[PDB]
Amino acid sequence: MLSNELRQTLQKGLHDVNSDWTVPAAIINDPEVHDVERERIFGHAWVFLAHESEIPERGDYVVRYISEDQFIVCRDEGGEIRGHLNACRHRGMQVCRAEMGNTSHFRCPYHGWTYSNTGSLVGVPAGKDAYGNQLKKSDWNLRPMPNLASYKGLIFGSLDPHADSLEDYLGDLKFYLDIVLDRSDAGLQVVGAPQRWVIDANWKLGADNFVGDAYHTMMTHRSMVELGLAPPDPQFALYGEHIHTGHGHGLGIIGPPPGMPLPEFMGLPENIVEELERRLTPEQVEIFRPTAFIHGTVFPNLSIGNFLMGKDHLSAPTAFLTLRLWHPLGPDKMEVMSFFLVEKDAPDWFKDESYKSYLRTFGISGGFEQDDAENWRSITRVMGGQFAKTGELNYQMGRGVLEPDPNWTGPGEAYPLDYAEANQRNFLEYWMQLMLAESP
Amino acid sequence: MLSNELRQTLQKGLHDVNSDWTVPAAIINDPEVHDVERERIFGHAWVFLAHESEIPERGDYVVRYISEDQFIVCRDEGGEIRGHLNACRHRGMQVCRAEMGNTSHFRCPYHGWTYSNTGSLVGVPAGKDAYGNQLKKSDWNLRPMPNLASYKGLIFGSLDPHADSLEDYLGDLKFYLDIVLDRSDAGLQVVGAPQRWVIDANWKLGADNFVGDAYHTMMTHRSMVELGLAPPDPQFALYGEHIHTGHGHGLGIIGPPPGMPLPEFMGLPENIVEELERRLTPEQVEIFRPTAFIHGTVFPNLSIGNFLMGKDHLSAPTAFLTLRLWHPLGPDKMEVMSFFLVEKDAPDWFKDESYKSYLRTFGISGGFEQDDAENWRSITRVMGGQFAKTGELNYQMGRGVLEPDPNWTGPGEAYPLDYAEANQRNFLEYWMQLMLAESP
Amino acid sequence: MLSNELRQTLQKGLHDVNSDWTVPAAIINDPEVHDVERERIFGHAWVFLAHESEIPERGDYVVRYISEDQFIVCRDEGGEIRGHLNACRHRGMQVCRAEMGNTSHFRCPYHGWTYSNTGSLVGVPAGKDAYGNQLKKSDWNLRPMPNLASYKGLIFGSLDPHADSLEDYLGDLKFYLDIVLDRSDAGLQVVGAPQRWVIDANWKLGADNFVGDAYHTMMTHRSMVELGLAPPDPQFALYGEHIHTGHGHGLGIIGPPPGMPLPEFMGLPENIVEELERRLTPEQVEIFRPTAFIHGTVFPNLSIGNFLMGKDHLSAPTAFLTLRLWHPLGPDKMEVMSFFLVEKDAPDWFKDESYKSYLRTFGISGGFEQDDAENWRSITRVMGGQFAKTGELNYQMGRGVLEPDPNWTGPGEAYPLDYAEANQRNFLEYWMQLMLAESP
Amino acid sequence: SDTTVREITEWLYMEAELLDAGKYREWLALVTEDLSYVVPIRVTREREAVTDVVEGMTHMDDDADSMEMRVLRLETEYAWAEDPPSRSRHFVTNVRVATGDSEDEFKVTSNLLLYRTRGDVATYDVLSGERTDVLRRAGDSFLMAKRVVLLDQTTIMTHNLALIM
Amino acid sequence: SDTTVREITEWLYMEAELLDAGKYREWLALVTEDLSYVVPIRVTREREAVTDVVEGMTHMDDDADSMEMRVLRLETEYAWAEDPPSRSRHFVTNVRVATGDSEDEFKVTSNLLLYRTRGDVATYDVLSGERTDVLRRAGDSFLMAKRVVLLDQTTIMTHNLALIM
Amino acid sequence: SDTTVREITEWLYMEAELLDAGKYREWLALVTEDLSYVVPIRVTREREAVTDVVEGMTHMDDDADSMEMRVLRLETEYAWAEDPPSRSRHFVTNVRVATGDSEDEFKVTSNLLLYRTRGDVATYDVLSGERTDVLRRAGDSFLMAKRVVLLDQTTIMTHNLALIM
Ligand SMILES: c1ccc2[nH]ccc2c1
Ligand SMILES: c1ccc2[nH]ccc2c1
Ligand SMILES: c1ccc2[nH]ccc2c1
Ligand code: FES
Ligand code: FES
Ligand code: FES
Ligand SMILES: [Fe+3]
Ligand SMILES: [Fe+3]
Ligand SMILES: [Fe+3]
């Protein structure tokens, strides 16, 4: 079931993404595209679930998703990370109906089958009475998430058991994930819980935005440019870098103009730049020394944001980390799950200041992200009619000017500015490759 | 239109339902399963509509469904039971927009075509003026429900004109329907109107529950075990019987432990056990003498409940009958239509006491059924993702222990306890047989 | 992608629409019929959008639809009428998020691409910085509505670039549109804005109602017959005419009985009947001299109403024009966009009086139309089950009596009364012809 | 004001109580011979633009005669749009009473959330708006001189406006 | 009445504040030993017909013992229908206080809009009805003798009636 | 309290009247230099567990400067999230006034049902929550020292929180 029309327009697009530098618009709001995308992309790719610091002690769990599939992600009583499917083996009831918590066991409400947080079925009510001991428990344990692995805290999951290891899948991106996750000894921490809300926009539009859209800062976030919360210089992204990997990944690094002096590293606490100088490759530190914005997506629907920004119109900027899921609910619907992370050993003052820079700029009520959600939700609206799905998205920025950086000191294909859309094209290319793949 | 994937997983299941004793989980929450189910199951099977006592006098009607199809079920002015489709012959308007009532005629609001409750078009406004008498009325009567028949009060209907008579379809179940419907001279009565409400759960889950799920009483209705409204003995179902028929039907009888003394028959009024002793087969009375809970489904989506239960934590149990429809609204939605029946000639005190035992335990606000609605609605949720639809429902209770009862005195395949799932497996087997049937 | 079952029932219908004089009922509430209808009917036919008087000066725009496709309909700074698609060329954002207004330019909020109301991209932010002047603007202008044309004020639009000119498409109907649109020198005007609301009814039911359903006046608008707002004579439509064209169009003219004296022309102001006597064909004036109600549809979903009616139960009738769109939202949903037009040079007293006759009878809160919306919404409900979609709509009015008028002085196939359904059958015939058309 | 608040507020609840009970004729005993009951049309426009509300055109624009016809229609037995009647609830909240242009007149502003249901189908409609009234004194109670129901919608989410708000 | 209005109104808000907070046991300290809490069934019938409300059958028909059971059930730790609890909001509007059949009794009519949500899924339920209460005097406050929640629906739009209205 | 009830209640209606009219700058004249406007995050947990509300993280956590930025942003002509503005209605019900931790301070609790609509599409959003305010006295009226909007949802049903509640 790829239909004949969708196969043809996916193939035409795969051709145009490298030649014309456009992509077929039919890929944003189609019920058909969405169902194929359920198996082809989300049914194979490595989707993010939780951060290890959400579940520190034994028993702690969070309930997270791959598309419609609900998975308990928890730390079982032996200490290890588990990702159980949240459907009983008996009749398929939710063994856990909270979203967060701490429990040793998971008693299913329907009949009573008790499971350890370890996964294995420990107790069946009326073992002798009903089943006459003829029930073998070991064969009826919570289905393990086919593929489960973490990377420096980030618990990714995959539905395909014959897929690349999470380390191979991230590949050369690991280099850049590190400058964001591996900065301190104690590790990063997710503060509280993610903000979870529903935008009426196709997920790829947010994912597209973070891979390499710094160009948009000036029109859509023009309100913030006027208040002094966004860079006032129309060529602020030109002092930046446009990196991408295979597997659709990609990011973008922006630092300040040559004159403009901003603290080395994002102004991170004295005590953590000392730890980051020795924890990261001597090259990695030099990439991170001048940087002020890092924005990227780890393919499917996870986006990272490390932005140096102000909590209001009267405060000096302070740095914040944010991981966010663009969870796909339907063709024209997503659920943002926006996390906020901070170094554990960072001072409370910085933990508090960094959180208010995130809140007032990004997230549900941010001055930046609320305009992003209005743009995405309107693209999706109009991209849902037949004459519109006929047209094409234009990704021609840099055509006949994009020369890979000879002086770049990190892996992947880099360009020596941030006004480019080679990240977004590559993101869609892998999207399309996975779409057509008759065999994974 | 069965697709290739659904055909294969239906066939794989038909194989597993008797061998592995599991069933494919993809059959609970699939948009494809549901559409096929519309024709294959509800387009052929015998679906319940009304009880004859809802429409006693001439003109009385109720508006009832087979799936999306709306049917006036009424008693025409000649005395007979009619099941008209509720769509005008002219332009297909609802000829009746109430849900209950009493009328001699049905005047369609659009143009004025008046119909008798008999079905035949009696008056067309502007006969001479518009049509010039050239309109033949007899050919334009409310489409009769293809197949219409009642069983001891129960007005069933079917969309297939070439289908087994309702008597043959019920088959050997008639024996057990009798012990519930045929107990008194004056007959059973539906009191007031059914409770109608919307659960967000696939219909089969409620139907699956009543065929033979007494096992669940202890975990899900644990709240009620603590209050003394449910049997406290963890092996209370063991004193029971697990009967089923062909055509997917099946029920479950539970009586009290050998010691525990409960009134002969469910404690029904002196005056009706006198009438039931002579009205039912000498065997039927002996099956009914000790019984305390009878729970079953008449295939598609009708469930019977004859439970001896208390109206609150301080009252002695009294018996109540309940018929209920699990009306299918979509893949992940149903509308419960829960009726409450009582013998006409039963004393007012028992009519009142029986009704309060029904209310406070089952129905919309019951202490029992409100937990059933939470479990079903959660199974459906999680059974709606792709990795979950890959798994299987476990129906292995009794595997290598279920020996048919040689001492059972009634028809169908009986087992000598109530902790079994051979009713539920047979229910799904017929379900699957009907599903694959290229020719009815 | 026109299934095998739908093709067969469409063909069976095309046979029955001229022979049996019925139509298959499966064409009203089918998800499959709707999707095919999106391309076959609304992807080719000429759909109405705006009236030229909604956009008088330069800059004035309205946002209107062909199905799900959103189009800015405006008067560019050169004076001409434009119909741009409302999706940016870059990433496909709404370049305009109002529904009405006046603007010279359309700045896209996402990245900043400024468009003239002329269509052509005038400014790309960071021309040198991002694109390095290598961006050719001329190739990235707002997609023009494939086919755009107005008829005597009525701005129609079509998605098919190889389709008949709007004049040829209206064809012989132009004769009747004229008696409604071309009556005065200054032209008609749309007053204020349309009423836009959501009925839960398939669009074809309203469209079917206006083509030639005067027959319904007596039962559905019986309330209004009792108040003296509708004609009390059961054969009032018999003094009328039943005209239709090719391309599915068709109308219906009703005048008063021979005795009953009503002012010549609908009582239109002295100053505009002077202008209408010379503006219209000497024959057209004689058709319009006695008329009191003109009701029709211009195929797909535009309906005209020129009715002589009262503003309340105590006022003498005054004439009103109304154009309305039955916008298709889904299989069982439409959005009425009901316009009210009046001659520009008509006195203010008549402008005000005519508006109150419209309001109190037709539109959202009318005494007439509110019952129409209840009938359509209930047909759609019941016509959404499988047993109902099996049946057929009856269009047999006049079978073996309809003799074309030899004395009719206007084009198209006329009948000498308004109690007929030959208009509605022709409407559905063209509907079905377009449906099956493998090649347009 | 005070106590005139207590009296206008309980008027608006009694008016709502009559409307949700189907007693439209009894409601018409309220309203004034120079009544103006209007429901303006709204369109999406930008903040800049002068106004949201369409001039010249309306969803409902009744005077007392036209409103009497509207109740007269529903008293007939062929008012199909309401003859199996709707189930409505008029949720009158945020009542703000302020003195009128004359003496004994009061500008009475309320928030309305109309809940509408129609016969057995599992769907409901919700109209949200703000009524700006003018309540005249008549005896020991009030009479309605004018109402402007300004809804929070441009595209109206009901099939018809057969209920008074 | 006055001041008895201020006191019954703030009673109904406190009752709602207890119910949305899950404090059902504390709510049971209100209610009277001869309590009757009933939620009638409704069916679509024509305007002509005598009534809408089904006689003999109900959605919920409690006295004080049965109501105590209902709270007793929720105090146990196996009340799955509410054990990850709902989020509810009881929107008490249109309060109309009027004198009772006896002295120190008041017929207290409110409009309810119950908003219900259940755990992480992006859907909500809304029950709309009109409660007709009878509040007795007990000390310096009131006690509830009777309630009739008449909802504006025939087919109820929630999976169960596990919340008190 | 009385009469302070009449005055706090009418403040909450005037505050809502300003908010639904888009007059955010005028609303900012209310609020206090030590304002705290917070919208907590909620998660489904069991009845047993200590609390529902997430600590350390919030949907919106403003002081007076940050709130002034929020209004400042909307006064600019490039605030796309609201520049064709929403249609909102703040339904302030169940007002409960109770004395504060100090003199001249009052803990003011209301039920909010925010109704949101966005331009011509046939869909609406509904946020239901409970605001717990702290109203200070300032002259012959009040000023808002603090608000906590606790919504009855864990997954928020709007695309952004661009409206003040
Ligand atoms: C600031 C700068 C560049 C960016 N790209 C995505 C978000 C964002 C914020
Ligand atoms: C009591 C005992 C057994 C049962 N099976 C289904 C409901 C029910 C109630
Ligand atoms: C009066 C007479 C005939 C009609 N056909 C459609 C509307 C209408 C009004
Ligand atoms: S489905 Fe889990 S115990 Fe029965
Ligand atoms: S549709 Fe019933 S009379 Fe025409
Ligand atoms: S989407 Fe319009 S400027 Fe980029
Ligand atoms: Fe942004
Ligand atoms: Fe149960
Ligand atoms: Fe009509």
CSV table of N, CA and C in Angstrom, one decimal, chain E residues 3 6 10 12-14 16-17 20-24 74 77 82-85 87-93 113 115-124, chain F residues 1-3 5 42-48 52 91 93-97 109-113 124-130 150-155 157:
chain,number,residue,atom,x,y,z
E,3,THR,N,-29.4,38.0,51.4
E,3,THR,CA,-28.5,37.5,52.5
E,3,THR,C,-28.6,36.0,52.7
E,6,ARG,N,-27.1,35.3,49.4
E,6,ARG,CA,-25.7,35.4,49.5
E,6,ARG,C,-25.1,34.1,50.2
E,10,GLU,N,-23.2,31.0,48.1
E,10,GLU,CA,-21.8,30.6,48.5
E,10,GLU,C,-21.7,29.2,49.1
E,12,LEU,N,-23.4,26.7,47.5
E,12,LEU,CA,-23.4,26.0,46.2
E,12,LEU,C,-22.0,26.1,45.6
E,13,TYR,N,-21.2,27.1,45.9
E,13,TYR,CA,-19.9,27.3,45.4
E,13,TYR,C,-18.9,26.5,46.3
E,14,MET,N,-19.2,26.4,47.6
E,14,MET,CA,-18.4,25.6,48.5
E,14,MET,C,-18.6,24.1,48.3
E,16,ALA,N,-19.4,22.9,45.3
E,16,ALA,CA,-18.7,22.6,44.1
E,16,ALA,C,-17.2,22.6,44.3
E,17,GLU,N,-16.7,23.4,45.2
E,17,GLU,CA,-15.3,23.5,45.6
E,17,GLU,C,-14.8,22.2,46.2
E,20,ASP,N,-15.0,19.3,43.1
E,20,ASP,CA,-13.8,19.4,42.2
E,20,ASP,C,-12.5,19.1,42.8
E,21,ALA,N,-12.5,19.0,44.1
E,21,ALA,CA,-11.3,18.8,44.9
E,21,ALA,C,-11.2,17.3,45.3
E,22,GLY,N,-12.3,16.6,45.0
E,22,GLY,CA,-12.3,15.1,45.3
E,22,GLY,C,-12.7,14.8,46.7
E,23,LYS,N,-13.0,15.8,47.5
E,23,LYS,CA,-13.4,15.6,48.9
E,23,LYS,C,-14.9,15.2,48.9
E,24,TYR,N,-15.2,14.0,48.5
E,24,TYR,CA,-16.6,13.5,48.5
E,24,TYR,C,-17.1,13.2,49.9
E,74,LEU,N,-15.3,5.0,46.7
E,74,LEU,CA,-14.2,5.9,46.2
E,74,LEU,C,-13.1,6.1,47.3
E,77,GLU,N,-9.2,1.8,47.8
E,77,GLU,CA,-8.1,2.1,46.8
E,77,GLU,C,-8.2,1.2,45.6
E,82,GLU,N,-12.2,6.1,39.0
E,82,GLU,CA,-11.7,7.3,39.5
E,82,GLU,C,-10.4,7.3,40.3
E,83,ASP,N,-9.6,6.2,40.1
E,83,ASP,CA,-8.5,6.1,41.0
E,83,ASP,C,-7.1,6.6,40.6
E,84,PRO,N,-6.9,6.8,39.3
E,84,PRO,CA,-6.3,8.0,38.8
E,84,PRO,C,-7.6,8.9,38.6
E,85,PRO,N,-7.7,9.9,39.4
E,85,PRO,CA,-9.0,10.7,39.4
E,85,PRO,C,-9.2,11.6,38.2
E,87,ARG,N,-10.3,15.1,36.3
E,87,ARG,CA,-10.3,16.5,36.5
E,87,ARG,C,-11.6,17.0,36.2
E,88,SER,N,-12.4,17.5,37.1
E,88,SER,CA,-13.7,18.0,36.9
E,88,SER,C,-13.8,19.5,37.3
E,89,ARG,N,-14.7,20.2,36.7
E,89,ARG,CA,-15.0,21.6,37.1
E,89,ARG,C,-16.5,21.7,37.1
E,90,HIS,N,-17.1,22.1,38.2
E,90,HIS,CA,-18.5,22.2,38.3
E,90,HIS,C,-18.8,23.7,38.2
E,91,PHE,N,-19.4,24.1,37.0
E,91,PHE,CA,-19.6,25.5,36.7
E,91,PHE,C,-21.1,25.9,37.2
E,92,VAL,N,-21.2,26.4,38.4
E,92,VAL,CA,-22.5,26.7,38.9
E,92,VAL,C,-22.9,28.1,38.6
E,93,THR,N,-23.9,28.2,37.7
E,93,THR,CA,-24.3,29.5,37.2
E,93,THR,C,-25.8,29.7,37.4
E,113,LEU,N,-22.6,23.2,34.4
E,113,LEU,CA,-21.8,22.8,33.2
E,113,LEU,C,-20.6,22.0,33.8
E,115,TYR,N,-17.3,20.0,33.5
E,115,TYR,CA,-16.3,19.7,32.5
E,115,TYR,C,-15.5,18.6,33.1
E,116,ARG,N,-15.3,17.5,32.3
E,116,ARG,CA,-14.6,16.3,32.8
E,116,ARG,C,-13.4,15.9,31.8
E,117,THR,N,-12.3,15.6,32.4
E,117,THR,CA,-11.1,15.2,31.6
E,117,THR,C,-10.5,13.9,32.3
E,118,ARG,N,-10.0,13.0,31.5
E,118,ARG,CA,-9.4,11.8,32.0
E,118,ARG,C,-8.0,11.4,31.5
E,119,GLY,N,-7.0,11.9,32.1
E,119,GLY,CA,-5.6,11.4,32.0
E,119,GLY,C,-4.9,11.5,30.6
E,120,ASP,N,-4.4,12.6,30.2
E,120,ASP,CA,-3.4,12.7,29.1
E,120,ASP,C,-3.9,12.7,27.7
E,121,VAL,N,-4.9,11.9,27.4
E,121,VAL,CA,-5.6,12.0,26.1
E,121,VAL,C,-6.2,13.4,25.9
E,122,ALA,N,-6.2,13.8,24.6
E,122,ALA,CA,-6.6,15.1,24.2
E,122,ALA,C,-8.1,15.2,23.9
E,123,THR,N,-9.0,14.9,24.8
E,123,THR,CA,-10.4,14.9,24.7
E,123,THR,C,-11.0,15.4,26.0
E,124,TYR,N,-12.2,16.0,26.0
E,124,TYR,CA,-12.9,16.4,27.2
E,124,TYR,C,-14.4,16.1,27.1
F,1,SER,N,-17.7,39.1,54.6
F,1,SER,CA,-17.1,40.3,53.9
F,1,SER,C,-18.2,41.3,53.5
F,2,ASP,N,-19.1,40.9,52.6
F,2,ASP,CA,-20.1,41.7,51.9
F,2,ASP,C,-19.7,43.1,51.4
F,3,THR,N,-20.3,43.5,50.3
F,3,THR,CA,-19.9,44.8,49.6
F,3,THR,C,-18.5,44.9,49.1
F,5,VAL,N,-17.4,41.8,48.6
F,5,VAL,CA,-17.8,40.8,47.6
F,5,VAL,C,-18.3,41.4,46.3
F,42,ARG,N,0.1,20.0,35.1
F,42,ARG,CA,-0.5,19.0,35.8
F,42,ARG,C,-0.2,17.6,35.1
F,43,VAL,N,-0.2,16.5,35.9
F,43,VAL,CA,0.1,15.2,35.3
F,43,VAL,C,-0.9,14.2,36.0
F,44,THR,N,-1.3,13.2,35.3
F,44,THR,CA,-2.2,12.2,35.9
F,44,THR,C,-1.5,11.4,36.9
F,45,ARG,N,-1.9,11.4,38.1
F,45,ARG,CA,-1.4,10.6,39.2
F,45,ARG,C,-2.5,10.0,39.9
F,46,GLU,N,-2.3,9.0,40.7
F,46,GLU,CA,-3.3,8.3,41.5
F,46,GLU,C,-3.8,9.2,42.7
F,47,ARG,N,-5.0,8.9,43.2
F,47,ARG,CA,-5.5,9.6,44.4
F,47,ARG,C,-4.5,9.5,45.5
F,48,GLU,N,-3.9,8.4,45.8
F,48,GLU,CA,-2.9,8.2,46.9
F,48,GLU,C,-1.8,9.2,46.9
F,52,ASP,N,-0.9,16.5,42.3
F,52,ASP,CA,-1.1,16.4,40.9
F,52,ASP,C,-0.1,17.4,40.2
F,91,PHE,N,-15.2,33.2,31.0
F,91,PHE,CA,-16.4,33.0,31.8
F,91,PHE,C,-16.1,32.9,33.3
F,93,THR,N,-17.0,32.4,36.8
F,93,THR,CA,-18.1,31.9,37.7
F,93,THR,C,-17.6,31.5,39.0
F,94,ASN,N,-18.5,31.0,39.9
F,94,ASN,CA,-18.1,30.5,41.2
F,94,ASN,C,-17.1,31.4,42.0
F,95,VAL,N,-17.4,32.7,42.0
F,95,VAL,CA,-16.5,33.6,42.8
F,95,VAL,C,-16.6,33.4,44.3
F,96,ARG,N,-15.5,33.1,45.0
F,96,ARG,CA,-15.4,32.9,46.4
F,96,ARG,C,-14.4,33.9,47.0
F,97,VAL,N,-14.9,34.9,47.7
F,97,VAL,CA,-14.0,35.9,48.4
F,97,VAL,C,-13.8,35.6,49.9
F,109,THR,N,-11.0,33.4,44.7
F,109,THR,CA,-11.0,32.2,43.9
F,109,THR,C,-12.2,32.2,42.9
F,110,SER,N,-11.9,32.0,41.6
F,110,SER,CA,-12.9,31.9,40.5
F,110,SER,C,-12.8,30.7,39.7
F,111,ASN,N,-13.9,30.3,39.0
F,111,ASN,CA,-13.8,29.3,38.0
F,111,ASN,C,-13.8,29.9,36.6
F,112,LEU,N,-12.8,29.5,35.8
F,112,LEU,CA,-12.7,30.1,34.5
F,112,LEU,C,-13.0,29.0,33.4
F,113,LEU,N,-13.8,29.5,32.4
F,113,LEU,CA,-14.0,28.7,31.2
F,113,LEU,C,-13.7,29.6,30.0
F,124,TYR,N,-13.5,25.4,17.8
F,124,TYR,CA,-13.2,26.2,19.0
F,124,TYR,C,-12.4,25.6,20.1
F,125,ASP,N,-11.7,26.3,20.9
F,125,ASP,CA,-11.0,25.8,22.0
F,125,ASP,C,-11.6,26.2,23.4
F,126,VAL,N,-11.5,25.3,24.4
F,126,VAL,CA,-12.1,25.6,25.7
F,126,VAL,C,-11.1,25.2,26.7
F,127,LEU,N,-10.6,26.2,27.5
F,127,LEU,CA,-9.8,26.0,28.7
F,127,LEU,C,-10.6,26.2,29.9
F,128,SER,N,-10.5,25.2,30.8
F,128,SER,CA,-11.3,25.2,32.0
F,128,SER,C,-10.3,25.1,33.2
F,129,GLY,N,-10.4,26.0,34.2
F,129,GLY,CA,-9.4,26.0,35.2
F,129,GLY,C,-10.0,26.8,36.4
F,130,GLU,N,-9.2,26.9,37.5
F,130,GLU,CA,-9.6,27.6,38.6
F,130,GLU,C,-8.5,28.6,39.0
F,150,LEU,N,-5.0,27.2,37.7
F,150,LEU,CA,-4.8,25.8,37.6
F,150,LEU,C,-5.9,25.1,36.7
F,151,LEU,N,-5.5,24.8,35.5
F,151,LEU,CA,-6.3,24.2,34.5
F,151,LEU,C,-6.7,22.8,34.7
F,152,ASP,N,-7.8,22.3,34.2
F,152,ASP,CA,-8.3,21.0,34.4
F,152,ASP,C,-7.9,20.1,33.3
F,153,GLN,N,-6.6,20.2,33.0
F,153,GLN,CA,-6.1,19.4,31.9
F,153,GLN,C,-4.7,19.1,32.2
F,154,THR,N,-4.2,18.0,31.8
F,154,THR,CA,-2.8,17.8,31.8
F,154,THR,C,-2.2,18.1,30.4
F,155,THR,N,-2.7,17.5,29.3
F,155,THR,CA,-2.4,17.9,27.9
F,155,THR,C,-3.2,19.1,27.6
F,157,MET,N,-5.3,21.8,25.7
F,157,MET,CA,-6.0,21.8,24.4
F,157,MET,C,-6.1,23.2,23.8
